[PDB]
Amino acid sequence: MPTLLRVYIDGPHGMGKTTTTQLLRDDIVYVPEPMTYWRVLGASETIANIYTTQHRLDQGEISAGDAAVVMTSAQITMGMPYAVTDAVLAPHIGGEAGSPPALTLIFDRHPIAALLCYPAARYLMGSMTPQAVLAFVALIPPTLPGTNIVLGALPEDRHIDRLAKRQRPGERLDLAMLAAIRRVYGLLANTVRYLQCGGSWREDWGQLSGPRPHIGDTLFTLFRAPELLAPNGDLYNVFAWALDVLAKRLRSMHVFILDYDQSPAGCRDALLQLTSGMVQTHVTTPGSIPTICDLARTFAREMGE
Amino acid sequence: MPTLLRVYIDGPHGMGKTTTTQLLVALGSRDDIVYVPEPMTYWRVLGASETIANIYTTQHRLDQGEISAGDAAVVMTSAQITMGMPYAVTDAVLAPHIGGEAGSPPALTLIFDRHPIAALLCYPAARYLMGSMTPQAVLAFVALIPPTLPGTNIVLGALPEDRHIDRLAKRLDLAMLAAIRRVYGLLANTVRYLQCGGSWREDWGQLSGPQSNAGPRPHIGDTLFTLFRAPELLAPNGDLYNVFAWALDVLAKRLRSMHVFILDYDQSPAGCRDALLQLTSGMVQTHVTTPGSIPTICDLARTFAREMGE
Amino acid sequence: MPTLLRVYIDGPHGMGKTTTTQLLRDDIVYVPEPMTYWRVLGASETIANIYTTQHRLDQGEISAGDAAVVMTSAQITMGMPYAVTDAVLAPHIGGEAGSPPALTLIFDRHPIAALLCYPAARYLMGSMTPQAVLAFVALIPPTLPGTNIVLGALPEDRHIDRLAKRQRPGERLDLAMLAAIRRVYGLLANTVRYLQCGGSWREDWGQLSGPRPHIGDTLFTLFRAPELLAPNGDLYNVFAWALDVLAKRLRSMHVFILDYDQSPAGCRDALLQLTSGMVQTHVTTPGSIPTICDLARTFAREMGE
Amino acid sequence: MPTLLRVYIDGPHGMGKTTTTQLLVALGSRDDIVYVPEPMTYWRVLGASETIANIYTTQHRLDQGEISAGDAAVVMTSAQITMGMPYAVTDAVLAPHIGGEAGSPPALTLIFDRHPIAALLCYPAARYLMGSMTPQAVLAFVALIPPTLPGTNIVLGALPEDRHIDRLAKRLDLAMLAAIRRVYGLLANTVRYLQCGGSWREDWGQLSGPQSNAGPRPHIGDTLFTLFRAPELLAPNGDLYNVFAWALDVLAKRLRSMHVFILDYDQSPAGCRDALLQLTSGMVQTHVTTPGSIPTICDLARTFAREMGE
Numbered sequence A, C: 001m002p003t004l005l006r007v008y009i010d011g012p013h014g015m016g017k018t019t020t021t022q023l024l025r026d027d028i029v030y031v032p033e034p035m036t037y038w039r040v041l042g043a044s045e046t047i048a049n050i051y052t053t054q055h056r057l058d059q060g061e062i063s064a065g066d067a068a069v070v071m072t073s074a075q076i077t078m079g080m081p082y083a084v085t086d087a088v089l090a091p092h093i094g095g096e097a098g099s100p101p102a103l104t105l106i107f108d109r110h111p112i113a114a115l116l117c118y119p120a121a122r123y124l125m126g127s128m129t130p131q132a133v134l135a136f137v138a139l140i141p142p143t144l145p146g147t148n149i150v151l152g153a154l155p156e157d158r159h160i161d162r163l164a165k166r167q168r169p170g171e172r173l174d175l176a177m178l179a180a181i182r183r184v185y186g187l188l189a190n191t192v193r194y195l196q197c198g199g200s201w202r203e204d205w206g207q208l209s210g211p212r213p214h215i216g217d218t219l220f221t222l223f224r225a226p227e228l229l230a231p232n233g234d235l236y237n238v239f240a241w242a243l244d245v246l247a248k249r250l251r252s253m254h255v256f257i258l259d260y261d262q263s264p265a266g267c268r269d270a271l272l273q274l275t276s277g278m279v280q281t282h283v284t285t286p287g288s289i290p291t292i293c294d295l296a297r298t299f300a301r302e303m304g305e
Numbered sequence B, D: 001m002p003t004l005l006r007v008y009i010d011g012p013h014g015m016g017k018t019t020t021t022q023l024l025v026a027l028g029s030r031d032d033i034v035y036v037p038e039p040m041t042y043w044r045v046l047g048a049s050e051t052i053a054n055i056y057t058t059q060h061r062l063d064q065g066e067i068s069a070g071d072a073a074v075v076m077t078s079a080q081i082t083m084g085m086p087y088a089v090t091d092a093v094l095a096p097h098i099g100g101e102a103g104s105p106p107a108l109t110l111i112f113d114r115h116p117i118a119a120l121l122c123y124p125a126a127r128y129l130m131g132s133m134t135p136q137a138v139l140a141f142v143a144l145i146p147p148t149l150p151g152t153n154i155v156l157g158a159l160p161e162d163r164h165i166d167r168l169a170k171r172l173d174l175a176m177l178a179a180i181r182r183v184y185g186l187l188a189n190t191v192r193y194l195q196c197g198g199s200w201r202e203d204w205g206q207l208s209g210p211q212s213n214a215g216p217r218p219h220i221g222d223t224l225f226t227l228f229r230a231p232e233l234l235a236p237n238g239d240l241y242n243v244f245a246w247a248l249d250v251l252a253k254r255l256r257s258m259h260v261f262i263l264d265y266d267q268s269p270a271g272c273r274d275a276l277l278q279l280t281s282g283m284v285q286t287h288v289t290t291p292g293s294i295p296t297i298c299d300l301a302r303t304f305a306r307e308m309g310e
């Protein structure tokens, strides 16, 4: 059975993933940003709606409840392409191969960006309830073998610079959102590591009110929100179970950090040198490769412009 | 390994589902049958404030022309996320304990008040027909439906519309009642169609202009695939965009391995109970993954019930 | 408190770590190969003794028992510099910093090379008992925070080529040893991953006789050796406890794969791009940096030529 | 948290250590005192074949001039790895359960038949004096001595040489007996020296040409630091190579936080027992890290005893 290498380029937007993936006929396929789905297919100018809603919340034109509704609804549209892609690809993924590959599938983001990271950042911006965030978490697809996710590293000033000259249709340069999104992804990397080193959120939970990251430097800190706790301060079981799922989904992910503070050619090599430690899997059928190729190419043609 | 029987009682609201279930639970030994109730407390307090009231108020507002379709859709989509939360989280923590199928007593019987598809497919689809939700959002929810675990037995209910209207009326939105009844009828036909070898892609062109585990193969027009022939999902060449076509592939995959049964609610509560009890005999059981899965499952259900079912 | 980045360049010898580390005044210090300790200080031509002993075992001049004694004794000498370095450095290492660093300490190998990997490979060459290997494992120092280890990737033919032109004093080009050492390091990488993904050796033990690597692709397979089992096939508790330590020591390590199938400049950049995902720690005293620098420079001056 | 008392009975062999320990264990309740015996079975069968016999045969062979110093050193080094295995593995799995120090009854008392330093320092050092081990290998073992956990109470024994020779003689290598007695005397002085503020680096130059927890500061020449002034460890400038100097730093660090006591074995078994029992009163206890650490520790000790102590 042929081998496959899946690479999910994620992290905060505005550092250069697009460029980095771009600089790069049958052995590698690229599933690009589904901008057409966000701007036309799924709804009308989804990014624009998102930034306009936060801006109005900031100005006091709408309430926090109004914003959260908009924001929750918008995230469903944003993640759609990722969720549908994962669902049809799942059955074709077999078990790990071990320490080249028939096919290399490079994706522009993983489902957790839309189901965990963006929503968590919006929660930090006061435009999304923590219950909605855990509801998206509860819907995160099972982590399949060989789930390699590349997160970016970049000093904030440089990030702002880079983000400013590459704004998306309807986007507004919001420094508070940049900080929130950067904080979530930093916590994300720490969480995977925490979990991989044996961290148990239920055992360390008490430390939030008192060789691995401290629970306070992981995504678990965000869920100490008062909306999720009973009158005695205990976490409701519904949410505690959602955190159990988060732990299980994140733990088996393989995280790779890509330094974006270099030229596009540097990033390109950087990324390519990073693939040697990535985990490959076998496919389930002999005709899985071809199907995967068409899926990816069809996705790109229809949603990546 | 000990065996497990999971039964999800679902279908349109107002038929007597909850009553029936509690009567069934009351018959069995204290610990060989557990109930996972309707998470009303999560819907009224924990996830958000009064969700059902908000859903109904939004629709009414839309009907009166006090808000736009867009305004309603954003509220319905967000409300549906909250509505489905408890079902999704329960399925996610139960998943790992479910083993392979065994055969048609068992160590434990888990009766559930609805299945994830109620909140991720059925209500959203009914709201799409009510004009308070977009077809794109409905398909987004469909794509998020968790993998269907082995031994997924779903009991849907049958009941004459005049009796249902009567039973339900003590708002009483009759248009929504008709829409949810139609959606559940489509659902049963969809499973049947899929189990008889039906391929939506092959029959798609037959579109234009119930029994779940018995009968001949239904026409595609009598299944859920007909709801998605909306102009929003169609490209300039007439066919469905691939994004949406893939969502329909997920829908087929998720519903084809389920075991659906129809329970006639047009009888007394005790009749319903005994009818349901008889139906369990042809249902599929599964093994559990660990020896301590049973206890864990009981605790999960009891915990759920205590915190969210009142 | 200043931050520190420790980088242990390890993996099978002969791929180019030396060159890679070499191509690279106060912010980075290099602790080189302690060749002088191996050839003179600790004993006389230790590498030579090692390869001569295997060769004689292969030719049938000495017995397996004779070889194991020599081999065990030799490994104590080989690891000495690493073990003493770790022991005096331990107290200065604080907790993780999180997602530049005051000091970057690049080492030529980590204690597990001499206490786990080489011995395991020699066990595979029939020149070391499995009990001795688990005895070295039991002596592996506690895994401190920020333990980043770089392992190399390189196709076998290329490795042989590279190994052939860079033989060490007294070394003999042994293809059976190359395979054994390459196999151990491949299993090592799989083991860390297995452990990080929740793998439990005691739970999966039964699979050796019947989203993570299968236990059969980890270092645990090597310890199914008959010398370690009781008459009923059970693992003796002494050894089972040694495997518990292995799991604990390996699990919190951060592994990074460096592709050595490129020019030295490529490897150098490759390695440097790999540092962005490495874990940094705080030191315990304000004067820890300076002390660390002198230790490293003193080590280099006395043992690295 | 429950408290724990760990006592390592060590010192030269042939003084009555084992007997004394078993008498002490026999006094306490069944489960408040557990014994971790000498792992003879690991030394005779499990780790290798007959290790002690091999050690003694090698030395004899060396003495007779039937093998070289190099041949003996390779065998002694490898034998010492096997000898220390069970102590090292036990310390590694016990470590995580040990908490901070409490004060001078406790939930559990663990009596050990020797400590890791016996196999990683004392015997190797004695073999160095016997010419069957190199000083470099001895220092390699020293560098591998595990971090000294809190509440490390070590009981060393005192006994006149004529009585010891008598007690030990039913080979009888008197040179080895003298070497091991000297090493243990040096050890006690080393701890004392370190606890009185002694700095080997400051006093190194005083080298040329017992009581563990009492008395004045011993001279460096009466401590273990004197054994390492060997020509093999000295650079051309006269001083120690840094590699070896760092090994001595590890030795100081490891022995300075230990609590050493001297037990007089020149009395009857019951006298020894009561003497030992009285000594436990000034020993340091520690808390355990988890509430279930006690049971785990008991099982570990019982398992160890069953598998390796006969």
Ligand SMILES: Cc1c(CCCO)[nH]c(=O)[nH]c1=O
Pocket (backbone or CB within 6 Å): A013, A050, A075, A078, A079, A109, A113, A114, A115, A118, A119, A168
């Ligand atoms: C992926 C994602 C982005 C990033 C898209 C890149 O510009 N932004 C959002 O507001 N929600 C999402 O979920």
Ligand SMILES: Cc1c(CCCO)[nH]c(=O)[nH]c1=O
Pocket (backbone or CB within 6 Å): B013, B014, B052, B055, B080, B083, B084, B114, B118, B119, B120, B123
């Ligand atoms: C499950 C569900 C119901 C049924 C709950 C009332 O019995 N109603 C909705 O409006 N959305 C849903 O998702």
Ligand SMILES: Cc1c(CCCO)[nH]c(=O)[nH]c1=O
Pocket (backbone or CB within 6 Å): C013, C050, C075, C078, C079, C109, C113, C114, C115, C118, C119, C168
């Ligand atoms: C590190 C090591 C090497 C590798 C040193 C690099 O040439 N070889 C051995 O035989 N034992 C060891 O432990």
Ligand SMILES: Cc1c(CCCO)[nH]c(=O)[nH]c1=O
Pocket (backbone or CB within 6 Å): D013, D014, D052, D055, D080, D083, D084, D114, D118, D119, D120, D123
């Ligand atoms: C502990 C030990 C002993 C003592 C065991 C006999 O009581 N003898 C040796 O030769 N080496 C050792 O390491």
